[PDB]
Amino acid sequence: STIKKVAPTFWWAGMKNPELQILLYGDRISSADVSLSADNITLQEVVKQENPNYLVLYLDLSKAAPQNFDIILKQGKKQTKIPYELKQRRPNASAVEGFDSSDVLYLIMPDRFANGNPSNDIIPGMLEGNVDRNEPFARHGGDLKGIENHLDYIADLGVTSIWLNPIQENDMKEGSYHGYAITDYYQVDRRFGSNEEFRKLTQEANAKGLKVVMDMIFNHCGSDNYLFKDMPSKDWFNFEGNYVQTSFKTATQMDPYASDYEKKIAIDGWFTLTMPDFNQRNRHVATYLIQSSIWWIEYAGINGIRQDTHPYADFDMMARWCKAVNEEYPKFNIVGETWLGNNVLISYWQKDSRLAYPKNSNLPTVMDFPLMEEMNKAFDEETTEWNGGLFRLYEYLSQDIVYSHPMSLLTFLDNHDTSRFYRSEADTKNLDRYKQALTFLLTTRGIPQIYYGTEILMAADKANGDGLLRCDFPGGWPNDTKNCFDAANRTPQQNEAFSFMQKLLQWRKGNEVIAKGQLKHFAPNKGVYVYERKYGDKSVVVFLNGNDREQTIDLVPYQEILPASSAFDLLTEKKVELRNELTLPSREIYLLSF
């Protein structure tokens, strides 16, 4: 009809926040006389703006039960009836579990994991009408069905959650594959699936014991989003809708020496030309985006959101967002991308930050990029008597007083924006670093994330561009020669790697010591880093030898974490003797239980 788009698509009765903003987009609709035909719904307000193609409606749902109702636009002789549903909430929707340190997240770029339906690789009408598996920056045809097809593999690997790069539609001319330029916040990308397919994926994942986390982006949308292409008003995007390039200097939010000029350039600046910057200080923009997040939580049953670009957005509005989400879903977890150089500035973004006080982001989980930088060097260097190697871990962790909630820090070796743990295929010839890094990651504090393909030694270097950071999982396509979803088609080394991660993950799942236990560590001792996780009377103890050589060490230092004269290494299932001294082969790892 005259109505092109209605947002949200639908809503629910009995949400904690009883307000509903319905955004209407169509042909010169703004002059219309608006009414409702409904049962116990109040139309509070109709908002008109420069662009006559939009109306913004504010409804009060406090007294309203599930129902179908009509929005009615009368313009002279013409009358349009827009039907609208208030669905009935699942029981206990509010009580959906979040994710936490008991979990391990498996990060998947949908377009690059598995093609389970080739018929949707190209969608008539969409601006990017091409797939080309040999172009790193083109669509390759991955989809939701593909992920659904391989849930068995993911669960068997031992992770507890899938985390998806953005699945919301990116109808862009170029670069649509990655998902970070959304053109519709209320639709899965038609090349990945329908909305229903995503709900089904989540159901299927939950039934195999897997949580689902979803990437969302409030800082910016794609330039082909109707909201941008046909702006309601200049106030919806920063710099009044004109492209000004961001500096990426997000330290300006908290830097005590920041300039006014630089704060504006950073936080109001656009990431690129085709990713215009939302003005989150606009009440309509903010509610639109907030509602979008809540919609996907109610509709799809997700356990988590990662808000990319969190520091590039208005601080106050993102605090309101986190508050509004947690008011509706008290156990839900949100992680923000805090890509900064140091723990000090990252800690500011975490909920209850001592350094932000009295400001509070309300953001439960932030990302430990500094730990990533250290872990990418700590297993390759010599650990001397004074410095290097595993000292990086000792020294970094001892600074955890900065962080308000250290067990709500996402930890990771890499992700879709970094070099992979192994930079090149050639580097994967030695798995020592892999084994130490993952032992550390999966036993120390925080919430681990594994990037898809880590478990089969996929390699990549940032210097060759972002496209090759996100190569196709070998096996995800019908015509792939080697299908690495099955052990039978994997190199010996790939199976060594896969089996190692799986051992740790399968052991970690359900393990209350790692999930909730105190942490206690010791300075590297003749190159050997030792630490303990301890919950009640159960404990775990890790030894990591930080050198390419045999080392004997005195065990007297560790008396307070060694309650018995021997224990079993979980990895080799062999006994380790704990009496006075211990000799550790080159790059040894012991993971003891007590």
Residues that bind Ca ion (CB under 5 A): 115, 117, 120-121, 141, 143, 219, 277, 312
Q: Which of its own copies, Ca ion, none sits in contact with 561, Cβ below 5 to 8 A by type?
A: its own copies
The yes or no reply on residue 555 touching its own copies (CB under 8 A) is: no
Measured distance CA(141)–CA(127) in Å, rounded: 15
Question: 527 a known binding residue?
Answer: no
CB of 531 to its own copies, least distance (A): 7
The yes or no reply on residue 329 touching its own copies (CB under 8 A) is: no
Residue type, 70: D
Contacts of its own copies in 506-525 (CB under 8 A): 519-523
State the CB neighbour count (10 A cutoff) for residue 24.
Answer: 24
Q: Classify the C-alpha dihedral 294-300-304-310 as positive or negative.
A: negative
Question: 467 a known binding residue?
Answer: no
Question: 70 a known binding residue?
Answer: no
Q: How many residues bind its own copies (CB under 8 A)?
A: 40
Q: Which of 399, 464, 552, 586 binds its own copies (CB under 8 A)?
A: 399
CB of 324 to Ca ion, least distance (A): 19
Q: Order of strands across the sheet with 67-75?
A: 11-12, 78-87, 67-75, 33-37
Residue of 271, 282, 273 whose CA lies nearest to 311: 271
Q: Which of 44, 203, 245, 259 binds its own copies (CB under 8 A)?
A: 259
Burial 197-213, CB ≥16 within 10 A → b, else e: bbbbbbeebbeeebbbb
CB of 187 to Ca ion, least distance (A): 16
Measured distance CA(226)–CA(224) in Å, rounded: 6
Question: 432 a known binding residue?
Answer: no
The yes or no reply on residue 342 touching its own copies (CB under 8 A) is: yes
Q: Which of 129, 203, 261, 499 binds its own copies (CB under 8 A)?
A: 261
Residue type, 95: A
3-state secondary structure of 72: strand
Which of 16-24, 61-69, 141-149, 394-402 is the region at the interface with its own copies (rule: CB under 8 A)? 394-402
The yes or no reply on residue 247 touching its own copies (CB under 8 A) is: yes
Q: Which of Ca ion, its own copies, none sits in contact with 277, Cβ below 5 to 8 A by type?
A: Ca ion
Nearer to its own copies, 218 or 348 (CB): 348
Measured distance CA(551)–CA(563) in Å, rounded: 23
Measured distance CA(177)–CA(191) in Å, rounded: 10
The yes or no reply on residue 540 touching its own copies (CB under 8 A) is: no
Q: Which of 354, 482, 549, 575 binds its own copies (CB under 8 A)?
A: 354
3-state secondary structure of 290: helix
From residue 150, alpha-carbon distances to 144, 153, 483 in Å are 10, 5, 12
3-state secondary structure of 71: strand
Q: Which residue in this structure is represented by tokens 């389970």?
A: 116
Binding site per annotation, positions = 115, 120-121, 141, 143
Site residues, its own copies (CB under 8 A): 247, 249, 251, 254-262, 341-345, 348, 354-355, 357, 395, 397-402, 406, 519-523, 531, 557-561
Binding site per annotation, positions for Ca(2+) = 115, 120-121, 141, 143
